Design a protein around this ligand. Structure first.
Ligand SMILES: *Cc1cc2c(cc1C)nc1c(=O)[nH]c(=O)nc-1n2C[C@H](O)[C@H](O)[C@H](O)COP(=O)(O)OP(=O)(O)OC[C@H]1O[C@@H](n2cnc3c(N)ncnc32)[C@H](O)[C@@H]1O
Ligand code: NA
Ligand code: NA
Lengths: 43, 611
């Protein structure tokens, strides 16, 4: 994640969900597929 | 004459992706002297790109039940999935994920210390009636990378023998049993006969039969092709899963969120064409509808670009702040993969292959099948797993996050089957002194080929033909035209020209072998699609729009005449090729409806497809 990196969380703990060691930045499944930086990884 | 080196192992695994590594690790951990033959370095296998999820009914976020995952997978398969293999996979998934965690894969965790799980892939609770399930597990943003490093790393202490940058050419078959594999050492050009009592084919997919796919150029169906060259059937090769919006020239898919955030699809006339095909839902229509609509735009002459072969996804009307905050990273992705500035220009996109449901037919134990006089039979000594196989857990349509799962479950199954039937050090069957000679003859013919057609030109012609005749839009006349074209291109293999005659790192030669393999996969895909006169899962025909089962499952079964096997389509396609002539032969075998234990997991009868 060079120019537009996904937000890394303190202690790798998502402050909203408390997930530890999971996906950074916005929730990858929020549009129904699995997105990273606008790429669809899986669906 | 070529330097020919013979090796002897207990087992040989062809492939070092998630499936092959799971099998090789399992065999080595159990004490089998195991070779793993891989054309790529293990951690460069396509599995490394699988950043997302793996499904397992752990029940950490709510009550779950693996039988509900079974149901979702059967329904998703559109009743072409074999319910015994689906039972096996879904019942094993919770244990498989916990095993991987124990081996060192750091699955993300809830506050309470359980593996965190997400809703994904339309999965449900309570046999479709319980709302959304949350059973999709992951590691940070790198699940597949973590899987490969975990299994590859753990195998090293058990002394798995890796043959890296070796290209498997053919199976060593003798009297209907597999006795190993013959392979090319790509670095030095030598030929290696790797004898073993059991062989596992885990070579991945064949997406590169098409013009746009999500895999790298090395996903060329090589294991499929080895099976075809042995006279063994491939299965369900017409069932290819597409996504509507892959970046033209790259194959990188972009999220439906681009349209959810307000992006729109445009054709060469500047029109928002989804308003025509889906007046209500527009660009947020279903993926199947968007894929079909984009394909018709291109077919009917409204494609964009010099070759009118894609359409546009427009985002530059959205305020840049929204793009940056709602779709962080899309600018970087569009620049990297398309050289496009999304604030100024649209992203060129077209439907793109993502997954191959079809492949080498197996039973639920990973044993490869032949089909003789209407009877399934295992091929002694031969196994397959992962995307190269067709167990078939996915039937006519793979569910999201089930593809990483199949790798670990069926790679493990192959190892377990071998362990249950054999012991380390069992006598390795011998091979005839000239075993493999036809593979060497073919290699030599390509190495000194001096025809008139470049490998890359023939490959591109095949890929374009598959994209234009055998992709999302399927109708008889077009499929029949495509069949003729692929058959003509198969004949053109005899006119190839190669440039490199050397023995050191002759990748020109490897690319030509891969083209031969791709062409065998393409032939079987398109002829199977032409023959299958129905719509099921990923195979949608304009001229046969209905799923054709042994009954009309939209109506009560009482009083219907059940259709003879030969009069319905709820059956697997088996394809064969006479490699010398290109002649394709199709046969069919029943779908397995029985589970492994009906009291534990009931067969799910076919039901109408819900949209
Ligand atoms: C393409 C893709 C797929 C994918 C994904 C993202 C992308 C970009 N994300 C996924 C996800 O988040 N969750 C999921 O459940 N699935 C996802 N997928 C699908 C999944 O990743 C793939 O289906 C899966 O990884 C396939 O694994 P498999 O082990 O079957 O295959 P592979 O990783 O491609 O490895 C193939 C190996 O075979 C060797 N090989 C191939 N041909 C030869 C020859 N001729 N000789 C020797 N070795 C050969 C390759 O070297 C490789 O090691
Ligand atoms: Na593999
Ligand atoms: Na497959």
């Amino acid at each position: 994640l060079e120019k537009e990196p996904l937000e890394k969380f303190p202690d790798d703990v998502n402050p909203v969900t408390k997930e530890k060691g999971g996906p950074r930045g916005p929730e990858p499944t929020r549009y129904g597929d699995w997105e990273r930086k606008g790429r669809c990884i899986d669906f | 004459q070529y330097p020919v080196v013979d090796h002897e192992f207990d087992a040989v695994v062809v492939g070092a992706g998630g499936a092959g590594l799971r099998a090789a690790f399992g065999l080595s951990e159990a004490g089998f002297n195991t070779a793993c033959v891989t054309k790529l370095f293990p951690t460069r296998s396509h599995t490394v790109a699988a950043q997302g999820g793996i499904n397992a009914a752990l029940g950490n976020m709510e009550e779950d039940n693996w039988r509900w995952h079974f149901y979702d997978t059967v329904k998703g398969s559109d009743w072409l999935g074999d319910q015994d293999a689906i039972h096996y996979m879904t019942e094993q998934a919770p244990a498989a994920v916990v095993e991987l965690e124990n081996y060192g894969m750091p699955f993300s965790r809830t506050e309470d210390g359980k593996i965190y799980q997400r809703a994904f892939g339309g999965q449900s609770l309570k046999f479709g009636k319980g709302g959304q399930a949350h059973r999709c597990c992951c590691v940070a943003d790198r699940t597949g990378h973590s899987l490969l490093h975990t299994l590859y790393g753990r195998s090293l202490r058990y002394d798995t023998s890796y043959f890296v940058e070796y290209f498997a050419l053919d199976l060593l078959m003798e009297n209907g049993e597999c006795r190993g594999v013959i392979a090319l050492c790509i670095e030095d050009g030598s030929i290696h006969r790797i004898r073993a009592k059991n062989t596992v084919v885990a070579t991945g997919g064949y997406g590169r039969t098409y013009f746009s796919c999500t895999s790298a150029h090395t996903s060329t169906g090589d294991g499929t092709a080895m099976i075809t060259r042995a006279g063994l059937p491939c299965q369900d090769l017409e069932f290819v899963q597409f996504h509507p919006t892959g970046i033209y020239g790259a194959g990188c898919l972009i999220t439906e969120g681009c349209r959810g955030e307000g992006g729109i699809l445009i054709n060469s006339q500047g029109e928002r064409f989804m308003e025509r095909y889906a007046p209500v839902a527009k660009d947020l229509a279903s993926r199947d509808v968007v894929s079909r609509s984009m394909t018709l735009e291109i077919r009917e002459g409204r494609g964009c670009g010099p070759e009118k072969d894609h359409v546009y996804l427009q985002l530059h009307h959205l305020p840049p702040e929204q793009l940056a905050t709602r779709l962080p990273g899309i600018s970087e992705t569009a620049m990297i993969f398309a050289g496009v500035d999304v604030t100024k220009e649209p992203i060129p996109v077209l439907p793109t292959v993502h997954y191959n449901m079809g492949g080498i037919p197996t039973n639920y134990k990973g044993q490869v099948l032949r089909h003789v006089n209407g009877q399934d039979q295992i091929v002694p000594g031969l196994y397959a797993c992962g995307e190269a196989a067709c167990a078939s857990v996915h039937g006519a349509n793979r569910l999201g996050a089930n593809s990483l799962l199949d790798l670990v479950v069926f790679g493990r199954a192959c190892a377990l089957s071998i362990e249950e039937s054999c012991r380390p050090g069992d006598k390795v069957p011998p091979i005839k002194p000239n075993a493999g000679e036809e593979s060497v003859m073919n290699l030599d013919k390509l190495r000194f080929a001096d025809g008139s057609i470049r490998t890359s030109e023939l490959r591109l012609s095949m890929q374009k033909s598959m994209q234009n005749h055998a992709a999302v839009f399927r109708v008889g006349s077009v499929l029949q035209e495509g069949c003729g074209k692929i058959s003509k291109l198969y004949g053109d293999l005899k006119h190839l020209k190669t440039f490199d005659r050397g023995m050191v790192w002759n990748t020109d030669l490897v690319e030509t072998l891969e083209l031969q393999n791709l062409m065998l996969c393409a032939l079987q895909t398109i002829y199977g699609a032409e023959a299958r006169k129905e719509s099921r899962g990923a195979h949608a025909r304009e001229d046969y729009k209905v799923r054709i089962d042994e009954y009309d499952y939209s109506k009560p079964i009482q009083g219907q005449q059940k259709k003879p096997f030969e009069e319905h389509w709820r059956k697997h396609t088996l394809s064969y090729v006479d490699v010398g002539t290109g002649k394709v032969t199709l046969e069919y075998r029943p779908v397995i409806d029985k589970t492994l234990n009906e009291a534990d997991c009931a067969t799910v009868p076919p039901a109408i497809r819900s949209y």
